[PDB]
Design a protein around this nucleic acid. Sequence first.
RNA 1: CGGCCAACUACGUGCCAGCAGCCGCGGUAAUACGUAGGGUCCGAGCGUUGUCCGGAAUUACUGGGCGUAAAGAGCUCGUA
RNA 2: GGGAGACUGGAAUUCCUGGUGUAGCGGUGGAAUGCGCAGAUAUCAGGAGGAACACCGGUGGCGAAGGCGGGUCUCUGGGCAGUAACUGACGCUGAGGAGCGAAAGCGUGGGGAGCGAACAGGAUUAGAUACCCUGGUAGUCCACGCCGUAAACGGUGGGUACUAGGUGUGGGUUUCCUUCCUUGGGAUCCGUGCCGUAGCUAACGCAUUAAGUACCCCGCCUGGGGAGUACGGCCGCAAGGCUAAAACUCAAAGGAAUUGACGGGGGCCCGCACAAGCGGCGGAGCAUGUGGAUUAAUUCGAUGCAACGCGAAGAACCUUACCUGGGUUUGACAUGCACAGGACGCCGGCAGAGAUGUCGGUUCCCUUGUGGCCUGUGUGCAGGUGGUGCAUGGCUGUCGUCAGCUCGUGUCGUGAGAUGUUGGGUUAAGUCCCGCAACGAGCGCAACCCUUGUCUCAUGUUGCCAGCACGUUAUGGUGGGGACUCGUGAGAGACUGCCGGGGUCAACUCGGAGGAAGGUGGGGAUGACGUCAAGUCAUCAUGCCCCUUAUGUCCAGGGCUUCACACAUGCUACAAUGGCCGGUACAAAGGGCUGCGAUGCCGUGAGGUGGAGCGAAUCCUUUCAAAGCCGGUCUCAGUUCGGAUCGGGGUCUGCAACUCGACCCCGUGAAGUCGGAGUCGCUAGUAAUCGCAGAUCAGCAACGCUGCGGUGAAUACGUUCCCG
Lengths: 255, 207, 153
Amino acid sequence: MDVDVSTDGELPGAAEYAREKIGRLSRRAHRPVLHARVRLTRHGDPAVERPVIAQANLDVNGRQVRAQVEGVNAREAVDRLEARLRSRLERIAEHWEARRGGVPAEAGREWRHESEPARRPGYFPRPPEERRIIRRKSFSMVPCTVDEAALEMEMLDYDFHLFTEKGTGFAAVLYKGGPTGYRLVLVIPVPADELSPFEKPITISTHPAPCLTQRDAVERLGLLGLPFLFYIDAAEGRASVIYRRYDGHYGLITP
Amino acid sequence: GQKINPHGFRLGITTEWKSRWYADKQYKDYVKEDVAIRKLLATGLERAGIADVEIERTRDRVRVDIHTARPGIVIGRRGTEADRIRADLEKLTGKQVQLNILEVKNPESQAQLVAQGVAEQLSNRVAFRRAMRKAIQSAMRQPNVKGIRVQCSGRLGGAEMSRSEFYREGRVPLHTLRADIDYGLYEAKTTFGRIGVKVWIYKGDIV
Amino acid sequence: PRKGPAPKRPLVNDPVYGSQLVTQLVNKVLLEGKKSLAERIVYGALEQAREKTGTDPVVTLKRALDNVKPALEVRSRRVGGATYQVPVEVRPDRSTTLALRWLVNFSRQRREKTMVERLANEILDASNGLGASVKRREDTHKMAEANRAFAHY
RNA sequence: CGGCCAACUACGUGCCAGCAGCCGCGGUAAUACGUAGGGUCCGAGCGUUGUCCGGAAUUACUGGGCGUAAAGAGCUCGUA
RNA sequence: GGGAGACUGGAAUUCCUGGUGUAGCGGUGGAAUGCGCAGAUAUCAGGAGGAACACCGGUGGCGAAGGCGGGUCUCUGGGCAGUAACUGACGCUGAGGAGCGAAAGCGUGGGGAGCGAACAGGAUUAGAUACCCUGGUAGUCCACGCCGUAAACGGUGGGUACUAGGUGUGGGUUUCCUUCCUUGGGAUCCGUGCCGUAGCUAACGCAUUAAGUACCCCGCCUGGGGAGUACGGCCGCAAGGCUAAAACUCAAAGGAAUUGACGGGGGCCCGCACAAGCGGCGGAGCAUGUGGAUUAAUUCGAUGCAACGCGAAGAACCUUACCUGGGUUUGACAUGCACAGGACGCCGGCAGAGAUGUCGGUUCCCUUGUGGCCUGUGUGCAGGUGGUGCAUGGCUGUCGUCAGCUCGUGUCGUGAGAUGUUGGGUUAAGUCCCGCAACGAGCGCAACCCUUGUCUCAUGUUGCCAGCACGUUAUGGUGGGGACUCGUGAGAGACUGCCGGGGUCAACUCGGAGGAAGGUGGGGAUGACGUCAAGUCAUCAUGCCCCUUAUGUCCAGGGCUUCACACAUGCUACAAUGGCCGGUACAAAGGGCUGCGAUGCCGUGAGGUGGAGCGAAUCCUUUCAAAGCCGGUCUCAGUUCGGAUCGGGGUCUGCAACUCGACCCCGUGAAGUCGGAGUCGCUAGUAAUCGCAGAUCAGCAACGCUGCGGUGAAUACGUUCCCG
């Protein structure tokens, strides 16, 4: 490390002492230092109790660390400047050991500015305690085609819709298939040829709607995280679509 | 530096130039003799408060209009003071120079005169607070005066530490162009140094 | 942009080709305000491509753009006091801007002795899928794929 | 003879010489150092030191307190 | 869930055994030690063992305190309510004393799954005897005993009586709604919380569960350290515990609360702050400034933002304040008290580097009292860029053109202080609206000013020329003309003015019409209270100190330009988006009298001669430019790039270009191949790039500064990170 000292007036021996005292702080800086300068001045007025003024500037990897002290002589000023610079460099570290106690920790305990925001679902929580099923629509079970079902979707502003298919005579549910288009799920999977003709670009889910109970359906919805579950009820034997409502209850659509 | 001089801020809108003449080749010597006349009239008269000095020049003939609150002191009953000022104005290479001595109507609505009085009182023995209080209360009595601020800086009271103090009464919007602000600055000479006094006074606005 | 998005400048269509894209290209290759020289360079490059291939400049230019147009990129995102290279979807305007910038920059490093010839060769190679800009698109798509695990935030 | 605490100016000196019961005064312009004027309190006395009481409700009987300032035993049973 | 003893239940962790089964498992902010490939992790079945008891489960119960919940049984302590049968003050407290007393720790004997001091490696770090990771011994567990400490806290000793209430919750008795289901409600006794009177307190707060009002008993305190330490003593296997000083030293140590400041605390916002981009710096040569070194001197000031092309808008001499040497002293320059005068003053010669000295010619007008000049003699005195910007004025920078800083009266608090200035919304804004123990006001914001973008009226010279005539190429050049520009006077025009929608029908906000311009249109001038003892005793002034035969003053020469290096600001480049040559088109602004200076002529070219016309809308700076466009050539090279350095020859200014000017001509032809860590500027006529002009100025170090125009981009998803 190389230091330049720009003294002023009569300060014999201050330059060497300041050089050798400040150059020892290179190991303290955790990043390479560049062009570290020091300046010594003396107050002309004898009325000042601490006439000597010392200033130091270091460029630690682009970060400017500067300090300034007053003293009665060159030696005291240089020593105080060294202590001040050491404290500043300690507060500057920014390496992991010095930035590990401020990084957000745990999952829910403690909150910080950069702590990860809580993931909130669209629905009101309404935990399993008194969740209940307080919405049961049975809008339409008149047979429809894919295009007619899509239009019945669109003006209802509902992502999924349960109807009964024209060609099959079976219950089916359409939903937005994402970027792939739309997706159709039937109680028993059938190919497109048996399905009534359509013009919208859709795809058919190959899996069949399984048979399961109400509590099992709620458990599957909870452990599978889908926006809804379409299934054949075990007791009823017919189609059913459960979705988490906008109040936290489950919306069971039945024929 | 925070606030520019109010007279120069509204020089082209509200206030008027203190020297009135035209010169292209002879601008420099005109300025020289102008400042010589100003310093001569400032040094010659100090008892009576010199409010203002205008100079007008047309070729040879110069008209120096000087305003004071005590015209009788600066003028001679037999013309002795008039003769003195005339003779010392000829010697400034003013060729034919003639003086118009005039009197201010209200010698307490003038910021320069108020600063003059405040400095004169503060010089000898008067505590500064008394000076500002008396000056402000005397300024408010005048009809057209609607605001005043008086500020002094320096070693007030002969102390070892410089201080700045200011007292205001009314409205002093230094940022408003149409409002006219009479500004007066003067340096009082105390045994412990020099004390600066600035006075701003607001008398309505012109459009 | 702390208070909201800024308006966009509606650049005008070209006189001798009537397309927005060539005007965007001449603005990209513009240097020191020498718009006449940039227009000369671009028009000469288009004419060279036309003479070499025999078809219209604009269709092969669009083919080159679609060949070098990216769809996924990687950005440094800081979540929970930690930085990751997150793959991000690219808006169409940004994809077009990146494709044109890559074309110009890579044509500037060619060895065809002239800006017009370098640009013509680069656009032809991009149309045929051989240009260095195509390689840059392949590398950036590969980098987006490699960090797909960080796509959830 | 800065305030407690009656009684201010000039010269000499400058973080020195020194003063001081406490707070604190000496950094070329000191009412706190030394000397001169001036002043005040006492007066055959005037100050300093040493010892005791008071102010000290600061051992609180007259006349104090214990959540955080010092102060409730770690908690019960029980002898005088 | 009060305590002790005995028996016993299940989930899960670990290990072992046996199947299926592969190449990873484990761990972190990221990894590595580690485990596994000899079969791990995973999955199933079986077995062994130890510890703790998910749900119930809480500010809910019990206990004097420590503390106490898997289930069942046995033994046992306490409490509450009702009846009031019974005894009849037998009550309260308690020095010493005895007993109980979390965890850790000690002794003997067992047990040991998980966890885990100590101890190993792994990782981070400048260093890690730590935080994080992999293992892991005592210990945690049981039996019998020791110790006797805790933030053993409600930091609140025990008993009693009284002093507004309101509302949760645990236990028990009873009256009335009455279904008598129901926290129905009431009454009452005993607990356990929250809010709140009076009252108390320094305040915070306590407030029927007192820290209120009083009575009885006990313990404890007398400033902070030294010190709960030493000595002595008692207890203990030991660790150590209990009792417990002094010397010396300090003028304080402390409790509560207020205003700031700060935070690797939170929330809401801003800014080229970041993000997206464009061009750079840091690499090279040169110009400039600074540090350091050097020197006789390298004059002085300025040290992050806010010093470092700054004071310096012009250092060969002068400037100049520094050095060497030569002179000079009421002085280089002022003004007053005096003595003598008619000269001071000039002009030539000589000596000297010059200052200066000397020689030669010239000699005052008033008016008799003297005045103007200087001489010397003097005497007051001048004169200091000598010191102190921590004694100052004045001037300026900066936070920051950010939105904030205060005051009057009122109110609250013992007081510092608080409210107003907070809260919701909105804005560029403490801008405004609605609320509100506040009601108002002032400096700040905005507006009033300049310029610019549109139009109308007025207006025609030196400015335009559209329609008319003369023109000679040379063109508004000339007669003429207000028509279009332009010049400069007055005025209009943007005011959420109008419409639609959000909005508390409020501020305000989104969109639309109109218009040249739509929402402070664009840019300026303007910088609140103050901060940083910021800068300036070298613009100036100035208190105090200092010099005064010198730190004043005159002159010559030199220095401020020195150079083994370091830092900063810029310019030119590294080339083909270019170099060179030829042709050719478009600006704005500004300057000019002892200055701009044309035509012509002479030089290759700086330039020389010469002087037309101009104090200038006229003449000159050329009619003005360069980038630009067209044509030719060069062909990717240390080159026809780059220009440094050096040799020779000249011009101009200046008394004088050696130290130390600029420019011109010929030759010479270095580094330099787009530049590490890092870092800067910029949101539109902007960045980038091109030229012109001005100040200072005899000449210039100007590539610097201040203005003017030509051509003119990319990007902004959005506030997580950096700075303020």
